[PDB]
Every structure is written in structure tokens, then in C-alpha cells.
DNA sequence: ATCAATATCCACCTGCAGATACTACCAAAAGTGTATTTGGAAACTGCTCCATCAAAAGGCATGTTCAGCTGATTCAGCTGAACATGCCTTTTGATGGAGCAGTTTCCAAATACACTTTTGGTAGTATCTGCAGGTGGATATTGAT
DNA sequence: ATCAATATCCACCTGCAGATACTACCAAAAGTGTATTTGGAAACTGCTCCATCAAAAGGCATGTTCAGCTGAATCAGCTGAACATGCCTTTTGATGGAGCAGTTTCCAAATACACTTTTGGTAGTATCTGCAGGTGGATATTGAT
């Protein structure tokens, strides 16, 4: 009787965050686990081809990184380009 | 199983307030007589193409169900990409 | 024992993410900093359409964001609609918009 | 007798239909339509019913899209009346 | 002392260059606006010949078509004349 | 005799262009019309192909740079490679 | 000894593409089968596109194949055209066509 | 110095195959490079997708006939699938 | 009509850029033989969920009527096509030198893996709550006049 | 502007089903801890092919002239919107039976070497040629009359 993962929990934590008395509704926590798997393939994808036109056979927080640039536009680019050097740094500096 | 009725011409469901609806969403205000028949033959090459692609995926994984999952990556093929369905 | 996560500051699951890019073959191998770094990203994502989509909630008068708040969120916002431009969300509508000519009198 | 000068009722109508995201084609004919193209296709098939719904869904928001897209076609033909050729014009540069 | 009517040498020009496959913008005022717009992204920056060829191919490839969708576009209007909105008519619902 | 570089893709060229669309009649506004789209494509187009090359930690932009970003942008060309 | 794509009686290399499936993160394992079918589609699909712009080759007084003849096959088959609908052949130019009501008044 | 592999042979054979007084350009030849490529990674994309979909370790022929069937215009999937099963025919049967 | 200005076409000439030919020649895939690992079809069967069925509840088909939209017609005026006139920028070629790409190093960060811990999913059974859809009753939009 | 029919508002109102709760469980994750392998950054460098600069080539900027297109104004014919009416088909809630999906078996098929053979890429170098860009004279197209 296998385990369906998905993003729910870590959705709902984030949206506790930004809206402490907001709700949401399980069709739109759908949309919201489409959406995570849809943008993961893309950056993931983009990140893949990167690699293999380098003859990378990694995919580190670099390659990455330039998946981000390529896939989002102008602003929200900039920010995740952002919080996710910050969080590498962060995960460094714990070990 | 025994007899499974006869299915034909089922694009004449497709009605004409159905189909004035649609368009009001599209913020049409004017429409005319020709739209209906029109929209009911792209409708059909619409269906076509993602149920001819997603049948293709039932067939592979050897079932007798075509599912969302089906549809869903159907619908990803074609560039009209889905959300809330598994996708 | 503290997770990755933890470790990074991150709400999304480090770990999960780390799997999937395994088993979705994206390449042979997998660095550390990778997983924290797509988390992160899609962490950070998942917060600005949730803002955005509260937003909506609010301004309707609901408590519970449905898929037409988030369809107001991406399509009101000029980059979440790029993002999306290829993408529909289930049960979200559209932006009530009437082109000016049809509009009565003068 | 009263009676709304024609537009009228198509404006708010319009604005009704803006607002809301129900479905607009009722359900089991839209079924049907699904079923005898899937058994043209393949004959012995059956449906999760979510996979019916996902169609619809997908159905809807192009044929939605492509109104809007026609409506555009119309009016730069200075007409605020869609016809097939309104249709076509979008089906064409849409790379249909 | 003898002149040709207006149409008939842009028929003539259609049918030359619709023959022909020759990049129809001079490379050099091409390749400066190519690296004008890139030193937004990075400065000091070397172009192989052939990657500049690349987008002078592409380029031309994407105008050519859209000129023939701004042209249909035109036609729809009962025009015979392309306009500013024929080619934002295109863009548009091409989803630029 | 100072010049823009986006003046620098001329009328003529514009107008040849045009042709091979088959477009007869041309409006005196498609030129700076065409320039705009022009840069518009310009930029997405280059934008990604120096992502590329930043990656590949280069300090010029190779062909391939530029297929892989007109294989992205949904522009994909035959005949410069990959 | 004889090589895998004379045993499949193809000129395409089934030797080349079973290893550029492999290192190409497509899938963990691949079966012996695959390459070979692939190469075969491959190798169809090339005589196809040749086989059309030899004939617009001669057509245009030519023996030897050049981009033009290229495009020509392509965009007058309409599922050639359909399967490169998306793609440029360089220096390939355009189909004569002229719309009809841009032709002077006979 | 280094290798720079291409279907460009195999291209050529196949030209005198089908035109054997027909000859190819570098542009043309390098054109049905792109061509092959581009084909090679979409079919393979998709076997490749198909294969996780149903959880799947390999990529088989059944995996390439179906992403063939997905890809190409009624006619062309056709044919493909035609030449491919022979292919796999003549091969098994071989010693 | 004819008359001529100009474009276009066809046959033939030909030099050389580009394409074929070779063959040293050699590194590096491609095939072969054997030892070893694992994937998934098959045979079984538990159990969701699909088809299939009867009730009520709600929206489609149709005909009448005419408001006003489309498309035909006409025309006057601005606007782009054509084409002279000279003229300033691209094109083509020739040559150091920048950097790309080839090679070897070696080490930090990867994979492998064995035992240990925590987590997220469900599943059974729980009472808590946003809002759908109903109500009337107060106000806005619209179209006749 | 005035009235009046109709839509629209919205604020208050129980019904409930979907959401939030929790308790107990656990299988599969995830984390932890050496043991062993290696991918790619780093540093040094040969040699393309890139930027650059100069000689020659060649097409674009401008202005005049006006054909002919675009769009404004006028219009009737008639198509499509509104709406009354009659009523059939969809919606929705309940109950066996097909197929999917979860096991566990296990052998055919793939991986993983390692070692033996070859071909496909360069590159030296030389050889060959399809056709591009002339030529000229013949006919066709266009447009003035
Ligand atoms: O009363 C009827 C009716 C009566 C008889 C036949 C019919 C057929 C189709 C639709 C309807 C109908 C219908 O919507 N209503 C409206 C009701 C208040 O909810
Ligand atoms: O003689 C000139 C010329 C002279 C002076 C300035 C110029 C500027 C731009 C173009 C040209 C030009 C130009 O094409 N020609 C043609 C010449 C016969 O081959
Ligand atoms: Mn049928």
C-alpha cells in the first residue's frame, strides 16, 4: 500500500511563515506540489544538458546555479540566485 | 461484459451555450453563426492529439486504464503543461 | 544527528531533494552543495506565491487560498507569468479583462 | 415589457463568467466525446474519472485561450464580431 | 524617360529574394549591435566568427517569419500595407 | 558622422528582409518597429548564450554558446554544431 | 568478428549510438536492442531527407546537395516540415509564395 | 588535436545509397549532423522519460519504439517503427 | 491595338573554392570472452475504483422579433514606391598575439557501504471551522421617454 | 432629467464537508561513520583563430514626384442577441466485479571487467571538378500611347 511523498508539509511550514491565518484548500496545495516537481525538472534539467555540454559528469550547487539564471526571469533569478548561495555558505559553515 | 452501446456523434454535445459560455470567459461579446461548428471541429483535433499520446502511455505501461498521470504527461508533450492533477 | 536542512536554515527537505536528482538521472554524480541549493531555490519560490497568493485570499475575503488565488498571484505578477506562461492551473480562471472597444456608448 | 439592448446582456455575461472557474461544458456530454475519440483509437479502454476531469480541464483553458487570441483577430479587423477566420488567423500564428 | 508602377518592383524583389538565401543584413553592422548588446552582460568579451554567424542566421530566420505573419495579419485587416500593429498583433499571440 | 548601432541595421535591409516575407507594402513605422523587435531578440537570445559561456569560464562566446541558447529559447538551428 | 551494425544490416553506427546512450544519462541500464533500433530510425530518417533533396537537387539543375535543397525537401513535405517545424536550416532560405491578393489585376 | 566525431561517414554512405551520382556541400553535411543529433536526443529523450514513468531501470526497444510513435507524423512513426523492428529481427537472428 | 524600355532567359565559357582522394598511422572506441549482478515478467491474489445502474433537479432547443453590425460604395487626401543623384561605410585581405584547448598533477570531495536513528506517510477514529448557498431586503444599472 | 423594471449588492444565517487534530505505528527513509576511488581545479603552454588595421570595393542616404492605398463617411440588408416558452438529459448518490497494483520468485539479460582488433578521425598532401559568375543575343513583361 506504497507511500505517495510529496511537498505538502514543507508548502504548508512556508506558508505558516508568510500567512500565520491563511489556510489552503488540498486543490491548491496540488497545484503547489506541481508546481515544486514542474520548476525541480526544469532546474534539474536545465542543470543536466550544462554538465554534459562541459563534459561535467557533476552536477554541483554551481551548475545549479547557472540553471537558475537560465530558467527564471530578471528579479526572481536575482533573489534565488541569492538564498541559495546563502544557504550553501550556511551548510558549509556547519561542518 | 455484455454489449457496450454505440458512441457517435457526441461532438454535437459540445453545445451552442457551452460553447457561447467559453467564449464569454474569453471575453467575447459578439459571435458569429459559422463560431460554433468551427470550435467544435478544433475542439476535436485538440482531443485528438492528447488522447492519441496519452493512450500511447497506457499502452506502454500495459494497462486498460488510461489515467490522470497519462494526460498529464500527454498534455506536458504538447507544451500545455497541467497542474493539479499529479502534474 | 541534525538534518541538512536544519543545517542550512531551510523549511524543504535537503535530504528528499538530494534522492530525487539521484534517481532521476540528471548526471553521474551528485555534489553536497547541489541539494541544499535547489532547495533553497525552490524554497524561496514556493514563498513568493504563497505571499502573492494570500494576498488574493485577502482581498476576497477568504481565509483559504484556493487554486483561483493562485492563478490571480502568477497571472497579476509580470515574472510568475513568464515562469508559467506555459502552465495551467486547474479551476484558476482568468483575469477579468474586457477590450476597450466593446465597452458601450463613448 | 422591458428589454436590454443587445451587448448588454453579452457584457454581463462576460463579467460573470470572468469572475468564476467552474467548467462550461457539462460533464458527461463532454464524457462521451472522450470516450468515442479514446475508442476510435483503442477499443476496450477505461477512464479514471480524474483522468475525464484533467481532459476538461486542459480543454477549457485552451479552448478559453484561443477565444481570447480570436476576440484580438476580430478587432484588429476593426469588427467586434468573431468568425472562422478569426479563429484561423490565431491557429496559424499559434503554429497550429 | 519610362517608369515602373508602384508594386511592381517589390514583386520583383519578392520573387528575387524569395529564391535566394544570402543574409540580407551586412555582417559588420550586425556584428556590432550583436556585441553592443552582449557587453550589458559581460564585458571584455572575444565572439567566434561562427557563433556571430549563428545569430545573424537565426536572427534573419526569425525576422523572415514574422514579417510573414505581420503580412497576414495585414490581410486580415483588408490592408495590403504592414503597420506597427500587424507586427504587435503577431508577437502577441505568438506569445512574445 | 556619429551613428546608433541599432540605426546601423537599415532600412534596405529591413525592407530586403521584409521581401522575403513577401510583403509588398511596408508602413514607414516598421523600421523602428522591426529595430525594437530586433533588440528584444537580440538580448534573449545573447543573454543566454553568455550564460553559457560564463560557465564555461570563457572570455569568448563560442557557436555552441549560441545553439544551446537558440535550442532553449525554442529557436533551434541547424548548422553550427552539437 | 563483425561489427553490430552490419548484424542489422545498417549503415549507421549501432557500436556509437549504444555508448552515446550510456553517457548520456538517458537510463541506468540499456538493453541490447535499443541502440540498434535507434540507429535503425536514425539512419531512415536521414535517407528520407536525402532522398527528397537529391530530387530538388535535380530539380534545380544540381548533382551536388547544398542547404537550399535542404529546406526545399523539408518544407514541402508536410511531415518533414511538421517533425522541424521548430528548427532553421541555415542558409536555407524560404518557399516562393505569394499571397494571391497582393498579385495586380489581370 | 583532439577527436571531433560526427554521423558525417554514415551521412555520406547512406547519400550514394538513395543518389549514388548525388553529392553533399560541408554546410548540407553539417546540417543532416544537426539533424541526426537533434533526432537522436529527442527520441532518446522521451524512451528516457517513458522508462521512469514506469519505474523503470533500462531504456529498451520497446521504450525507443514508443517514444518513435510519440515524436514523429503518422507516415514517417510509420516507417521508423518498420525499419526499427526489422533491424532488431535481423539481428537477433545472427549469430 | 504598336512601340520601346527594360527585365529575364538560355547556352555556353571557365577558374578555383570546395570537395574528393589517400595513407601514414595511430589512439581510442568497438568487439569478444567469463565472471557476477540484478531487473523485471509470471504467477498469485488483496482490494480500490471503475462502470453501471435508478431518481430528481436543472439548462437546452426553438421561434419570434428587431437593434445595430458588417461590408459595400464612394472618394479625397497623405503616404509610401520608384528612381534620379553622387557619396562614405563595409568588405576583403594580411599578421602579431590572446586565449582556448591539450596535458599532468594530486587532493578534496565524491561513491561505496554497514549499522543506527529519525521522519512522513496513513490509517484509524477525532471534534473543529470556512464558506457555500440560502434568505430578504436595501441599492445600482439600464433603457423608455 | 424622470421613472421603473431588473440586476446587483451585501450583510446576516444554519449545514456541512472538507480541513485540521492525534494517537499509534513503521517502513523507509535519512543521518552517521570510516573505508577507497577519483573528478576536476589548478598550473603551465602550444598554436589556432580572433581583433585589428589597411586597400579596394560597392550600396545606402536624400530629395523629388505622384500613383494608388488607407480610412472616413454613408448606408441598407440582414445576421445575431434577447427572451418566452416547452420540456428532456444531466447530475448525483448507491452497490457488485474488473483490473491494477502489491507482493515474491528467479532466470534471462545486463553489467563489469579485461584483453584483442579495428575504424574512423586527422592531416599531410596531393588531386580533381561543379558550378558561379561571367559572356551575348534572343524573347518576354511591362507600360506608355
Ligand atoms: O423546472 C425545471 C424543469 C422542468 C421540466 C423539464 C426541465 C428540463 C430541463 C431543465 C429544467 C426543467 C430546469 O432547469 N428546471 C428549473 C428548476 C428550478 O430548478
Ligand atoms: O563609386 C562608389 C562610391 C564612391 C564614393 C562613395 C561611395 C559610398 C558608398 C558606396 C559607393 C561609393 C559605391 O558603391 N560606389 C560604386 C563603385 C563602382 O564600384
Ligand atoms: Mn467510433
Given at each position: 500500500?506504497?507511500?505517495?511523498?510529496?511537498?505538502?508539509?514543507?508548502?504548508?511550514?512556508?506558508?505558516?511563515?508568510?500567512?500565520?491565518?491563511?489556510?489552503?484548500?488540498?486543490?491548491?496545495?496540488?497545484?503547489?506540489?506541481?508546481?515544486?516537481?514542474?520548476?525541480?525538472?526544469?532546474?534539474?534539467?536545465?542543470?543536466?544538458?550544462?554538465?554534459?555540454?562541459?563534459?561535467?559528469?557533476?552536477?554541483?550547487?554551481?551548475?545549479?546555479?547557472?540553471?537558475?539564471?537560465?530558467?527564471?526571469?530578471?528579479?526572481?533569478?536575482?533573489?534565488?540566485?541569492?538564498?541559495?548561495?546563502?544557504?550553501?555558505?550556511?551548510?558549509?559553515?556547519?561542518? | 461484459?455484455?454489449?457496450?452501446?454505440?458512441?457517435?456523434?457526441?461532438?454535437?454535445?459540445?453545445?451552442?451555450?457551452?460553447?457561447?459560455?467559453?467564449?464569454?470567459?474569453?471575453?467575447?461579446?459578439?459571435?458569429?453563426?459559422?463560431?460554433?461548428?468551427?470550435?467544435?471541429g478544433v475542439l476535436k483535433v485538440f482531443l485528438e492529439n492528447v488522447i492519441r499520446d496519452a493512450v500511447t502511455y497506457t499502452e506502454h505501461a500495459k494497462?486498460?486504464?488510461?489515467?490522470?498521470?497519462?494526460?498529464?504527461?500527454?498534455?506536458?508533450?504538447?507544451?500545455?503543461?497541467?497542474?493539479?492533477?499529479?502534474? | 544527528?541534525?538534518?541538512?536542512?536544519?543545517?542550512?536554515?531551510?523549511?524543504?527537505?535537503?535530504?528528499?531533494?538530494?534522492?530525487?536528482?539521484?534517481?532521476?538521472?540528471?548526471?553521474?554524480?551528485?555534489?553536497?552543495?547541489?541539494?541544499?541549493?535547489?532547495?533553497?531555490?525552490?524554497?524561496?519560490?514556493?514563498?513568493?506565491?504563497?505571499?502573492?497568493?494570500?494576498?488574493?485570499?485577502?482581498?476576497?475575503?477568504?481565509?483559504?487560498?484556493?487554486?483561483?488565488?493562485?492563478?490571480?498571484?502568477?497571472?497579476?505578477?509580470?515574472?510568475?507569468?513568464?515562469?508559467?506562461?506555459?502552465?495551467?492551473?486547474?479551476?484558476?480562471?482568468?483575469?477579468?479583462?474586457?477590450?476597450?472597444?466593446?465597452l458601450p456608448k463613448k | 415589457p422591458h428589454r436590454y439592448r443587445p451587448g448588454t446582456v453579452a457584457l454581463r455575461e462576460?463579467?460573470?463568467?470572468?469572475?468564476?472557474?467552474?467548467?462550461?461544458?457539462?460533464?458527461?456530454?463532454?464524457?462521451?466525446?472522450?470516450?468515442?475519440?479514446?475508442?476510435?483509437?483503442?477499443?476496450?479502454?477505461?477512464?479514471?474519472?480524474?483522468?475525464?476531469?484533467?481532459?476538461?480541464?486542459?480543454?477549457?483553458?485552451?479552448?478559453?485561450?484561443?477565444?481570447?487570441?480570436?476576440?484580438?483577430?476580430?478587432?484588429?479587423?476593426?469588427?467586434?464580431?468573431?468568425?472562422?477566420?478569426?479563429?484561423?488567423?490565431?491557429?496559424?500564428?499559434?503554429?497550429?
Amino acid at each position: 500500500k506504497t507511500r505517495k511523498e510529496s511537498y505538502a508539509i514543507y508548502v504548508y511550514k512556508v506558508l505558516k511563515q508568510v500567512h500565520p491565518d491563511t489556510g489552503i484548500s488540498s486543490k491548491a496545495m496540488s497545484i503547489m506540489n506541481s508546481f515544486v516537481n514542474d520548476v525541480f525538472e526544469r532546474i534539474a534539467g536545465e542543470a543536466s544538458r550544462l554538465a554534459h555540454y562541459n563534459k561535467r559528469s557533476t552536477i554541483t550547487s554551481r551548475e545549479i546555479q547557472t540553471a537558475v539564471r537560465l530558467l527564471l526571469p530578471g528579479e526572481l533569478a536575482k533573489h534565488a540566485v541569492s538564498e541559495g548561495t546563502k544557504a550553501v555558505t550556511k551548510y558549509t559553515s556547519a561542518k | 461484459k455484455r454489449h457496450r452501446k454505440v458512441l457517435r456523434d457526441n461532438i454535437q454535445g459540445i453545445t451552442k451555450p457551452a460553447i457561447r459560455r467559453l467564449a464569454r470567459r474569453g471575453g467575447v461579446k459578439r459571435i458569429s453563426g459559422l463560431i460554433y461548428e468551427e470550435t467544435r471541429g478544433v475542439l476535436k483535433v485538440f482531443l485528438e492529439n492528447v488522447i492519441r499520446d496519452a493512450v500511447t502511455y497506457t499502452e506502454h505501461a500495459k494497462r486498460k486504464t488510461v489515467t490522470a498521470m497519462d494526460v498529464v504527461y500527454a498534455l506536458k508533450r504538447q507544451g500545455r503543461t497541467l497542474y493539479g492533477f499529479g502534474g | 544527528a541534525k538534518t541538512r536542512s536544519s543545517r542550512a536554515g531551510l523549511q524543504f527537505p535537503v535530504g528528499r531533494v538530494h534522492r530525487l536528482l539521484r534517481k532521476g538521472n540528471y548526471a553521474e554524480r551528485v555534489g553536497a552543495g547541489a541539494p541544499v541549493y535547489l532547495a533553497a531555490v525552490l524554497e524561496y519560490l514556493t514563498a513568493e506565491i504563497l505571499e502573492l497568493a494570500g494576498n488574493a485570499a485577502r482581498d476576497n475575503k477568504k481565509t483559504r487560498i484556493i487554486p483561483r488565488h493562485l492563478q490571480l498571484a502568477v497571472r497579476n505578477d509580470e515574472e510568475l507569468n513568464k515562469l508559467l506562461g506555459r502552465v495551467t492551473i486547474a479551476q484558476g480562471g482568468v483575469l477579468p479583462n474586457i477590450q476597450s472597444v466593446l465597452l458601450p456608448k463613448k | 415589457p422591458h428589454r436590454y439592448r443587445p451587448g448588454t446582456v453579452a457584457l454581463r455575461e462576460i463579467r460573470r463568467y470572468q469572475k468564476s472557474t467552474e467548467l462550461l461544458i457539462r460533464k458527461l456530454p463532454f464524457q462521451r466525446l472522450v470516450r468515442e475519440i479514446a475508442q476510435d483509437f483503442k477499443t476496450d479502454l477505461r477512464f479514471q474519472s480524474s483522468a475525464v476531469m484533467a481532459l476538461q480541464e486542459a480543454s477549457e483553458a485552451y479552448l478559453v485561450a484561443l477565444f481570447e487570441d480570436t476576440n484580438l483577430c476580430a478587432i484588429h479587423a476593426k469588427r467586434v464580431t468573431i468568425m472562422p477566420k478569426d479563429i484561423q488567423l490565431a491557429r496559424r500564428i499559434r503554429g497550429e
